[PDB]
Design a protein around this ligand. Structure first.
Ligand SMILES: *[C@@H]1O[C@H](CO)[C@@H](O[C@@H]2O[C@H](CO)[C@@H](O)[C@H](O)[C@H]2NC(C)=O)[C@H](O)[C@H]1NC(C)=O
Ligand SMILES: *[C@@H]1O[C@H](CO)[C@@H](O[C@@H]2O[C@H](CO)[C@@H](O)[C@H](O)[C@H]2NC(C)=O)[C@H](O)[C@H]1NC(C)=O
Lengths: 192, 645
């Protein structure tokens, strides 16, 4: 979805992957299910944690389909109904989430639909600690990975009062990417 | 395999023609070349025209042209740099390079009928709209007229298409006005960040009937002159007859932007036979300053203010001479036309630029190298002297110091300048060089100039050098390029170059060769030189009198104005009393200032040579990129790097 501004990605193959995800790998209630986890288990980052895995994996694919919506809205007409079914599943089970990672990745998914409001917005705001990061206990790589989705949510929601402490916190950490198990963290922090 | 090559300038311009020079080296058979220009970053495709075939009958040469359009998408970013991408596909092998872009599109020159106006009068003004080639272009111009504190009071928008690049316009000054300096600013519609300007004054005046000239004997002051500075006064009526009167004259000192007046420097001299003379002595100047050191006076400047009244007492003129330097040296030596890069083990030429203390060029002053008194030379008409050294193969930098040898003047009066030149770096320290040498004369259109190409390399690889490749850069675009063939044993070859009117005011010649040498490695060695051309018109407009008799005609008399000029040209006229210019002669447009504006817009920064083959092209203003991989240095700044000074 980012490389179409750079190289000539084949549109028939790309929306063919979108059609293959919707029909084969989506349950009728909105849940996407993985049938073959990756060999290099370090490149999935915070998604390696099995706690709240079905909510987080549903949010990851929904963000990827909504960013490729503009190209594949013409090719697959069942894309917005698939987004609505996945969005209803994430909105209904949003308040049960406890990890700051899962709240952040569902926050950017709900913000593109416009459903991150009220108590779902308030839980998303109070998930942040020191008003500049969405941190979980453990390695700092997952926390910068989690804060990267939440900065995208703040830019999507167009609430810029809470943005400059987050970006100033990201520059103070001085993260330059690379390393073992850094694929998700490096890609999302620079897109943010 | 053969190596493909593309040569273009450093910087490309909007709304003008850009030359693209394609060459293949060591090539066999025909090779088709397709040409494409893309945007940067991303791909939107801005120009997909032009293609050609490099042929061995043409020594695999091919020059093709293109033009850069500008739209609302191109004109979007106005403050920061943006780039484009040039694509050329040689058969099946593509060579491409990202190029810096300037947003300038041409030149605007503004002529006013007067340099100073009254409240309640008319300002007549013509705007000449030319491209980068100084040829009339039809574009939309945005002109604004601003107040002394910078408030736009009148603005215009008009296209000069089908009007031969001339916009004659008018505006009336109201009587409700603030006197002072008023500014006209103008810019093209498709280049809003390139702003041209010229100034005029608004005041309450009547014209005087005579002019006063204040003439220093020398345009500087030497501190240890016991006599002091002599300033001759010349006063005559505007029609050319001698003025009888009495002058009051006072001196002063200018330090930076602040002026200090010497009150006791006042004298009172009668003006007889249209002339007078006043001297400020050395004792009065030192008595005027409170610092008794003569050493601290160096670096500052003087000014003279005179007030002359006729002996009828009915008119008065105030004149001023300013900017007169207090110096130890009647000359200023500069290496400004000398390259800073020498060829080790190959002789090197020095072009020494010597000026008077005001900045005017010095004529026929002998200068010499500090090392050895035998090598001496006198300056030519433009203030340039020719010296040369016989270089050793030192890889260490070579310090060069030049000092004048003019007779009677003491050693404290002899100017000097010291620089340090840098060695050329060959590819892999192969010690294979290219040396250029040429005549140094004032160049007029119609003369021929012998260009000399000297090859230096071992003789095992001299048989592989079968040609040279040369290009001419003039006014920020490629004017001519080609090949000069070479047979074995001919380390020196000569190419005559005929000068036309397109070469005015200055041009750079670059030249290179290429081969696979050392241990089987591609080597490029280049050289460059900057040549000055005599500043003159491309055409030749002359205005003279049609009558040959009846000198000083009567007021109102009919006379014949004779105008000789180029066929097909459109001429504009204005006839002004000189008493306006005695009041204010600033901001007068002339042809020499036009070539000065073009030279200030030049993209080349060095008088030739360079640290390597890449530094030769980059300092000249050219980009090169080869299929093997050798290419020029990246440049992301439009302006030239500033010298240390
Ligand atoms: C009245 O008009 C004058 C111009 O006639 C302006 O004041 C001038 O301001 C400039 C600085 O921009 C000074 O160089 C001039 O000396 C000022 N002129 C004066 C003091 O006569 C301004 O628009 C108004 N000034 C006043 C004092 O009323
Ligand atoms: C580039 O190619 C053009 C072809 O249009 C050359 O222009 C011609 O040059 C020849 C020889 O100099 C002249 O006899 C012709 O009269 C020119 N054509 C026209 C239409 O006037 C141009 O000289 C070439 N330039 C370089 C540097 O190779």
């Amino acid at each position: 979805s980012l490389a179409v501004n750079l190289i000539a990605i084949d549109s028939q193959v790309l929306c063919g992957a979108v059609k293959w995800l919707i029909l084969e790998k989506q349950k009728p209630d909105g849940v996407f299910q993985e049938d073959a986890p990756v060999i290099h288990q370090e490149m999935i980052g915070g998604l390696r944690n099995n706690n709240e895995k079905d909510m987080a994996l549903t949010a990851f694919v929904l963000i990827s389909l909504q960013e490729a919506k503009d190209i594949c809205e013409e090719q697959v007409n069942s894309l917005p109904g698939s987004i609505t079914k996945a969005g209803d599943f994430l909105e209904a089970n949003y308040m049960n989430l406890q990890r700051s990672y899962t709240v952040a990745i569902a926050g950017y998914a709900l913000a593109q639909m416009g459903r991150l409001k009220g108590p779902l917005l308030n839980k998303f705001l109070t998930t942040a600690k020191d008003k500049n990061r969405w941190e979980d206990p453990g390695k700092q790589l997952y926390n910068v990975e989690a804060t990267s989705y939440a900065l995208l949510a703040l830019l999507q929601l167009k609430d810029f009062d809470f943005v400059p402490p987050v970006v100033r916190w990201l520059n103070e950490q001085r993260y330059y990417g690379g390393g073992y198990g850094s694929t998700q963290a490096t890609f999302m922090v620079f897109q943010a | 395999s053969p190596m493909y090559s593309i040569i273009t300038p450093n910087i490309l311009r909007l709304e003008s023609e850009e030359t693209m020079v394609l060459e293949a080296h060591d090539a066999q058979g025909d090779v088709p070349v397709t040409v494409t220009v893309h945007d940067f970053p991303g791909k939107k495709l801005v120009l997909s025209s032009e293609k050609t075939v490099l042929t061995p009958a043409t020594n695999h040469m091919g020059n093709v042209t293109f033009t850069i359009p500008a739209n609302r998408e191109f004109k979007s970013e106005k403050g920061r740099n943006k780039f484009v991408t040039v694509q050329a596909t040689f058969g099946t092998q593509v060579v491409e390079k990202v190029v810096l872009v300037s947003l300038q599109s041409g030149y605007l020159f503004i002529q006013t009928d007067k340099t100073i106006y009254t409240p309640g009068s008319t300002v007549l003004y013509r705007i000449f709209t030319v491209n980068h080639k100084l040829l009339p272009v039809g574009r939309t111009v945005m002109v604004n007229i601003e107040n002394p504190e910078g408030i736009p009071v009148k603005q215009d928008s008009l296209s000069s298409q089908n009007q031969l690049g001339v916009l004659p316009l008018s505006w009336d000054i109201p009587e409700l006005v603030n006197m002072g300096q008023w500014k006209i600013r103008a810019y093209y519609e498709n280049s809003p960040q390139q702003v041209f300007s010229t100034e005029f004054e608004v005041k309450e005046y009547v014209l005087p009937s005579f002019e006063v000239i204040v003439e220093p004997t020398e345009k500087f002051y030497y501190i240890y002159n016991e006599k002091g500075l002599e300033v001759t006064i010349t006063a005559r009526f505007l029609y050319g007859k001698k003025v009888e009167g009495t002058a009051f004259v006072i001196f002063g000192i200018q330090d930076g932007e602040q002026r200090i007046s010497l009150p006791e420097s006042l004298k009172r001299i009668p003006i007889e036979d249209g002339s007078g003379e006043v001297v400020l002595s050395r004792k009065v100047l030192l008595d005027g300053v409170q610092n008794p050191r003569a050493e601290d006076l160096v670096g500052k400047s003087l000014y003279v203010s005179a007030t002359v009244i006729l002996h009828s007492g009915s008119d008065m003129v105030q004149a001023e001479r300013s900017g007169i330097p207090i110096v130890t040296s009647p000359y200023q030596i500069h290496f400004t036309k000398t390259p800073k890069y020498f060829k080790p083990g190959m002789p090197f030429d020095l072009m020494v630029f010597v000026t008077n203390p005001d900045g005017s060029p010095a004529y026929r002053v002998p200068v010499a190298v500090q090392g050895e008194d035998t090598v001496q030379s006198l300056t030519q008409g433009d203030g340039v002297a020719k010296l040369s050294i016989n270089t050793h193969p030192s890889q260490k930098p070579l310090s060069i110091t030049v000092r004048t040898k003019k007779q009677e003047l003491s050693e404290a009066e002899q100017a000097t300048r010291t620089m340090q030149a840098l060695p050329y770096s060959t590819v892999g320290n192969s010690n294979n060089y290219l040396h250029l040498s040429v005549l140094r004369t004032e160049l007029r259109p119609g003369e021929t100039l012998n260009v000399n190409f000297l090859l230096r390399m071992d003789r095992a690889h001299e048989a592989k050098i079968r040609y040279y490749t040369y290009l001419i850069m003039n006014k920020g675009r490629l004017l001519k390029a080609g090949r000069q063939v070479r047979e074995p044993g001919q380390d020196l070859v000569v190419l005559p170059l005929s000068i036309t009117t397109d070469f005015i005011p200055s041009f750079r010649l670059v030249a290179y060769y290429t081969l696979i040498g050392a241990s089987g490695q591609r080597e490029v060695v280049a050289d460059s030189v900057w040549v000055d051309v005599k500043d003159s018109c491309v055409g030749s407009l002359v205005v003279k009198s049609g009558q040959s008799e009846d000198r000083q005609p009567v007021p109102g008399q009919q006379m014949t104005l004779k105008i000789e000029g180029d066929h097909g040209a459109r001429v504009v006229l204005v006839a002004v009393d000189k008493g306006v210019f005695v009041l204010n002669k600033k901001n007068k447009l002339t042809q020499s200032k036009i070539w000065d504006v073009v030279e200030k817009a030049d993209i080349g920064c060095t008088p030739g040579s360079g640290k390597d083959y890449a530094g030769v092209f980059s300092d000249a203003g050219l980009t090169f990129t080869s299929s093997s991989g050798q290419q020029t240095a990246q440049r992301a700044e439009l302006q030239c790097p500033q010298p240390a000074a």
